[PDB]
């Protein structure tokens, strides 16, 4: 189809011109104008929580686009998945894993 190849060309030109515009802005900024602590483990814990819950989020992303095809059985399975997710979240909050302040 002509429409899809036109849109592919437009998307390619969009990415190319955006990156080139930012590169040219940096080059013009460089060329113009004259010249002249230990991080706590809570950062790791928060990033780890983000990674784990983002994977469970991808499972829910795949479910959300095909809800009508899966029917009520898929609803029951996703309800079990979300209940396990929320039980893990409740466990994380109650044990002080998600409390930044001690």
């Amino acid at each position: 189809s002509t429409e899809v190849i036109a849109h592919h060309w437009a998307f390619a030109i969009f990415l190319i011109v955006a990156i080139g515009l930012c590169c040219l802005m940096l080059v013009g900024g460089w060329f113009l104008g004259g010249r002249a602590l230990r991080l706590s483990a809570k950062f790791y814990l928060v990033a780890m929580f983000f990674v784990i819950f983002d994977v469970e989020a991808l499972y829910l992303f795949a479910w959300s686009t095909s809800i009508r095809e899966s029917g009520w059985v898929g609803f029951v399975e996703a309800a079990i998945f979300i209940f396990v997710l929320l039980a893990g979240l409740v466990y994380l909050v109650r044990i002080g894993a998600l409390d930044w302040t001690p």
Binding site: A41, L45, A47, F49, I52, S66, L92
Partner: protein
Amino acid sequence: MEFAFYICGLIAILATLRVITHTNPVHALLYLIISLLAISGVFFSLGAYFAGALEIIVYAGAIMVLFVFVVMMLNLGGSEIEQERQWLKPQVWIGPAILSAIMLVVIVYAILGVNDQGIDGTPISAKAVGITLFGPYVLAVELASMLLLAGLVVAFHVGREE
């Protein structure tokens, strides 16, 4: 479609080769992110659109963020890593590289003797993936939730500070 496949595969190979031989951890992670973006382009060229989207969203957007985070927490200035360069010594890497090359030749010889009608590249959407995921692969989803729960519990138990 094939042209993007070969360029993205070449970029992934070169970036991974830069990863395994680099001394700076942040530069190595940046090359790894580049290789993951290239592999996402490979996924998009093969019609696995959900796989490429998750390759950027989760692999290059969550897991590499965790790796980068940990590298900042350590403040890795290359202490006894850059000052030695043990992996750059030929007597160190000549053995494992020969072993990996032998394994690659064996795997490639096994690969080349298989039937191949070609990959059509017809896009397999996330809707069909979610239909399979909550149909014939229900127990995979629920026990994968249990697996992520186990990873959460283990990483919380080990990675506390007190």
